[PDB]
Amino acid sequence: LHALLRDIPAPDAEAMARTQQHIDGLLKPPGSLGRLETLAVQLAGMPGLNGTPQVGEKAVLVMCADHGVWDEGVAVSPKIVTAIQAANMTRGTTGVCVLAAQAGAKVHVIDVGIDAEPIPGVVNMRVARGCGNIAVGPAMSRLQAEALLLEVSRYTCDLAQRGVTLFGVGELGMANTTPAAAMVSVFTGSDAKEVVGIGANLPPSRIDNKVDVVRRAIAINQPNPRDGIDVLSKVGGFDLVGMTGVMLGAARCGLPVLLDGFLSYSAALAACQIAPAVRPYLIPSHFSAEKGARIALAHLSMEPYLHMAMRLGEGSGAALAMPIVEAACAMFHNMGELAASNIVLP
Amino acid sequence: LHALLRDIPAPDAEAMARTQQHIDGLLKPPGSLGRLETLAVQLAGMPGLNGTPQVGEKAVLVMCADHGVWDEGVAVSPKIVTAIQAANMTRGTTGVCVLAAQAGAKVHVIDVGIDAEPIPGVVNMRVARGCGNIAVGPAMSRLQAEALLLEVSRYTCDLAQRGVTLFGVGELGMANTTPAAAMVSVFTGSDAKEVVGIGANLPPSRIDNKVDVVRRAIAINQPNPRDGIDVLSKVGGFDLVGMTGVMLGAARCGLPVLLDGFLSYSAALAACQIAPAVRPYLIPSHFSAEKGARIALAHLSMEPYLHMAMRLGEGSGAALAMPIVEAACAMFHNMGELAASNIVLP
Ligand SMILES: O=C(O)c1ccc[n+]([C@@H]2O[C@H](COP(=O)([O-])O)[C@@H](O)[C@H]2O)c1
Ligand SMILES: O=C(O)c1ccc[n+]([C@@H]2O[C@H](COP(=O)([O-])O)[C@@H](O)[C@H]2O)c1
Numbered sequence: 022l023h024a025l026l027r028d029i030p031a032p033d034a035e036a037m038a039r040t041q042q043h044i045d046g047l048l049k050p051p052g053s054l055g056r057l058e059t060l061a062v063q064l065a066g067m068p069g070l071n072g073t074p075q076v077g078e079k080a081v082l083v084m085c086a087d088h089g090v091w092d093e094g095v096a097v098s099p100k101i102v103t104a105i106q107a108a109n110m111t112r113g114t115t116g117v118c119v120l121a122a123q124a125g126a127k128v129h130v131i132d133v134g135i136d137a138e139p140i141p142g143v144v145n146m147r148v149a150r151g152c153g154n155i156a157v158g159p160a161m162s163r164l165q166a167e168a169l170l171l172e173v174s175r176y177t178c179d180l181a182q183r184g185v186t187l188f189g190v191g192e193l194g195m196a197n198t199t200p201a202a203a204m205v206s207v208f209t210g211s212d213a214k215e216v217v218g219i220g221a222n223l224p225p226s227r228i229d230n231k232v233d234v235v236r237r238a239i240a241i242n243q244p245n246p247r248d249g250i251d252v253l254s255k256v257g258g259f260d261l262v263g264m265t266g267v268m269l270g271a272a273r274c275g276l277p278v279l280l281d282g283f284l285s286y287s288a289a290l291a292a293c294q295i296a297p298a299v300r301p302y303l304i305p306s307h308f309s310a311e312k313g314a315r316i317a318l319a320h321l322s323m324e325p326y327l328h329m330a331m332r333l334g335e336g337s338g339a340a341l342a343m344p345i346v347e348a349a350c351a352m353f354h355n356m357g358e359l360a361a362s363n364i365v366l367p
Numbered sequence: 368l369h370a371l372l373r374d375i376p377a378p379d380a381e382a383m384a385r386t387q388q389h390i391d392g393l394l395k396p397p398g399s400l401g402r403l404e405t406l407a408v409q410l411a412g413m414p415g416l417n418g419t420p421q422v423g424e425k426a427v428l429v430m431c432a433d434h435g436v437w438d439e440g441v442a443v444s445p446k447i448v449t450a451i452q453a454a455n456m457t458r459g460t461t462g463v464c465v466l467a468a469q470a471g472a473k474v475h476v477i478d479v480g481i482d483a484e485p486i487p488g489v490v491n492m493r494v495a496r497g498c499g500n501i502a503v504g505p506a507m508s509r510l511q512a513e514a515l516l517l518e519v520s521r522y523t524c525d526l527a528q529r530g531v532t533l534f535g536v537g538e539l540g541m542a543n544t545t546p547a548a549a550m551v552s553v554f555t556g557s558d559a560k561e562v563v564g565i566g567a568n569l570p571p572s573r574i575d576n577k578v579d580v581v582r583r584a585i586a587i588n589q590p591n592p593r594d595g596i597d598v599l600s601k602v603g604g605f606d607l608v609g610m611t612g613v614m615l616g617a618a619r620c621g622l623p624v625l626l627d628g629f630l631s632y633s634a635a636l637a638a639c640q641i642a643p644a645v646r647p648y649l650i651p652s653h654f655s656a657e658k659g660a661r662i663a664l665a666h667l668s669m670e671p672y673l674h675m676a677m678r679l680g681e682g683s684g685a686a687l688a689m690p691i692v693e694a695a696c697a698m699f700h701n702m703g704e705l706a707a708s709n710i711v712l713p
């Protein structure tokens with residue numbers, strides 16, 4: 022693992038400089054394509070993309086797991102919805118399945134801790150049947166967190182060897198906006214009330230309890246904010262750990278990763294805390310409607326491309342943004358050049 | 368024309384209600400897909416879409432023309448760039464050409480007033496070789512404005528008969544952010560300084576002059592803010608009129624129209640002023656980096672889906688947003704239903 026984190030490649034400044042020069046010469050006023058140009062340069066800096074903004078195969082990894090804190094009354098969805106929805110993922114009927122298909126991406130359903138029997142068709146990497154209730158203790162041990170990190174990391178970069186050049190990250194797990202809020206509170210240093218949201222339609226009357234639970238998880242576990250792995254293992258969850266692992270794996274592989282919503286933001290905070298070298302490989306997708314989204318994004322210093330008020334999860338936002346990444350590549354490789362049309366602009 | 372404006376169909380509330388009910392029953396927490404759900408309902412209300420959110424063929428109409436006000440030193444791009452770029456449109460090398468291709472849409476280059484010889488391959492609807500200099504008088508007569516409105520309207524709805532169900536609007540014309548700023552100032556009642564931007568990389572030192580020109584155009588022409596056609600003919604342009612015509616045509620045809628950037632916003636302001644019944648058919652795409660974008664959008668009461676800091680024009684934003692409209696349709700027709708999985712959520 023330490024080896025893994027040590028070998029994460031830095032961005033290729035040489036390719037980035039060649040990228041900028043080429044973009045500036047395209048048939049358009051310099052900088053007129055804004056963030057689409059900035060995106061193309063970012064991609065060209067990623068060693069796995071072979072010195073140029075390109076997109077081969079696309080995959081969306083969905084980490085599924087249950088949480089013990091569900092028993093604290095912080096989620097109104099029946100706990101079995103995690104297992105049922107994970108099954109539907111294999112039938113291509115879920116939101117991410119439909120949005121991925123539209124983007125020509127393949128969805129990978131990974132079970133990292135669903136509290137139910139194994140689901141055939143789903144990748145089995147389950148640590149246990151749900152994580153511990155963070156309200157009364159840790160969600161898992163440090164070893165378990167590190168093991169899943171390494172496991173997911175390997176799985177991700179292994180896909181790269183099969184032609185995948187762009188990843189999307191996602192999750193599925195009733196009650197996960199609670200540990201996510203806890204993680205965001207710890208990493209950003211914001212009060213719990215400022216980052217706890219409604220999750221999957223939690224009644225306004227039940228918010229207070231959710232906030233108290235988050236505070237309790239922090240007070241009792243005392244997670245160290247300067248140790249991402251310590252935070253993940255204490256007030257996190259299997260699914261959150263898994264998303265963090267996809268991010269480390271893709272970074273080590275020198276490939277881009279599209280974030281999704283609020284849950285992904287907390288995993289990104291952990292990942293950047295564990296290995297800052299991961300930041301250059303992260304690409305935002307949409308701005309989640311979850312209350313703590315703004316705060317999380319600011320500390321990540323990210324500005325989402327899509328404002329859809331979405332709050333579904335599954336990596337649905339990620340899939341929705343994939344066409345945008347391909348547009349930056351198409352812009353780069355297919356546009357004509359000013360010099361060719363004898364056009365001279367200041 | 369009055370007949371045209373009289374026959375614009377109202378939205379189908381019955382289809383919209385059936386849409387909402389269906390969306391609420393999909394495999395997801397109610398409302399979790401946010402604006403993607405709202406979009407699907409809007410589409411279902413449009414008579415031309417046959418009571419359901421769907422997308423057949425897609426077209427992007429690009430209105431090209433030159434402006435007399437270019438002589439006031441408000442644009443740093445050589446005037447011939449309009450004609451040259453219009454030609455490149457027929458070669459598929461421009462920004463909108465590349466983004467449209469990625470979205471499977473066809474680009475329609477329409478010359479409504481380029482100051483140059485006719486360009487083969489380009490649809491000819493030119494009123495004159497550039498419009499009058501709005502700084503010293505009107506850009507065109509009311510008759511010319513109305514004629515082009517009717518002409519473009521007919522062209523647009525005629526395409527609908529060929530299988531097109533989704534339109535994108537765009538333009539091309541050096542110095543057009545000036546008349547656009549003037550129109551926005553008149554319609555919103557904002558001071559010129561608050562809505563005049565840099566356009567296509569106008570040096571900060573030359574902004575003052577641009578603002579004075581805009582004010583002069585208004586003072587000398589005295590456009591009536593309660594008469595969209597009066598505004599368009601006086602301080603507008605052929606390209607702006609054309610975009611307004613696409614919007615009226617699609618509305619009459621009961622079909623959706625995707626706006627693009629700042630120039631499109633001013634044409635949308637005119638269109639809604641001329642016929643309020645057009646509003647329900649308008650769909651925002653991106654948030655233009657032009658200074659007056661926020662003000663224009665607020666008066667249109669619209670919130671763009673994409674934040675890309677783009678300011679190219681050509682309808683490039685429109686094309687970029689087409690995949691989003693198709694995603695709302697895919698969501699609607701392809702997702703599974705809660706009742707089928709025996710899932711019951713509050
Ligand atoms: O991705 C988001 O921004 C997001 C925001 C709110 C809720 N969710 C989804 O809803 C679940 C978490 O909500 P909850 O109320 O059970 O804590 C989980 O399965 C997520 O996929 C997801
Ligand atoms: O679409 C926008 O928001 C947009 C914002 C700024 C500039 N433009 C493009 O640049 C031109 C207008 O810029 P300008 O400086 O000549 O007034 C015109 O050809 C547009 O296509 C377009």
Ligand SMILES: Cc1ccc(O)c(O)c1
Binds near residue numbers: 049444
């Ligand atoms: C070359 C160029 C100059 C100005 C524009 O608005 C454009 O779309 C292209």
Ligand SMILES: Cc1ccc(O)c(O)c1
Binds near residue numbers: 334
């Ligand atoms: C049916 C359902 C419930 C909660 C979710 O987070 C989800 O993606 C789907």
